[PDB]
Amino acid sequence: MELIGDYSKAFLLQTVDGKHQDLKYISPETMVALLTGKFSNIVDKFVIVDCRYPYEYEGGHIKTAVNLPLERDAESFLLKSPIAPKRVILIFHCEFSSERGPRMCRFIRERDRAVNDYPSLYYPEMYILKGGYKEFFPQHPNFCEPQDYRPMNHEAFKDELKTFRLKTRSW
């Protein structure tokens, strides 16, 4: 397997097959391994980036996840003052096997390459959570807050979906 983004070392986590062949995917069990400190002697900090809209996040998210659905906010949070360490790892996710998580992962890599001298990176190791929140919640509800799941297409949130789409950079 290839080295991480800055070619400094191998990827730390066991991976699973996902839709995008160019990206690295992890399972809910691996996400729990990170949250439970199984990799604490090697991983200084990891950030779970929930790419879903605010109403989805508010309805139930993974504990400690940061909601950064807009490219400009993810860029500001992650790259204005980079989270330095040991390894730093980013895990991106959305509701299921959609495109919000993968798009944000690729965007952050593009910006990280842009602000660095090749091949150095602030976030050389990034993964996508396979199956997103939809598959994580039924496996580990006690690692979620609140213990619920609100889909993007929830009947009572049609206006909220629309309101938030009008804040994105492109459609």
State which residue, 64 or 76, has the beta carbon closest to Cl ion. 76
As given in the structure block, the two tokens for residue 22 are 């160019």
Q: How many helices (H) and strands (E) does the chain have?
A: 6, 7
Q: Which amino acid is at 43?
A: V
Helical packing angle, 100-114 and 71-79, nearest 10°? 50
Query: Strand, helix or coil at 67?
Result: strand
HSE at residue 123, side-chain half, CA atoms within 13 A, is 30
139-157 in b/e form (b: 16+ CB < 10 A) is eeeebbeeeebbebeeeeb
State which residue, 104 or 129, has the beta carbon closest to Cl ion. 104
Residues in contact with Cl ion, counted by CB under 5 A, come to a total of 4
State which residue, 41 or 169, has the beta carbon closest to Cl ion. 169
Catalytic residue among 51, 94, 105, 144: 94
Q: How far is the CB of 63 from Cl ion (least distance, A)?
A: 25
Contacts of 117 by beta carbon, 8 Å cutoff, 6+ apart: none
Q: How far is the CB of 111 from Cl ion (least distance, A)?
A: 13
Tell me whether residue 94 is one of the annotated catalytic residues: yes
Q: How far is the CB of 170 from Cl ion (least distance, A)?
A: 7
Site for Cl ion in 130-169 (CB under 5 A): 168-169
Site for Cl ion in 26-85 (CB under 5 A): 70-71
Q: How far is the CB of 56 from Cl ion (least distance, A)?
A: 15
State which residue, 1 or 169, has the beta carbon closest to Cl ion. 169
Cα gap 69→101, rounded to integer Å: 9
Active site residues: 94
Query: Which positions lie near Cl ion, rule CB under 5 A?
Result: 70-71, 168-169
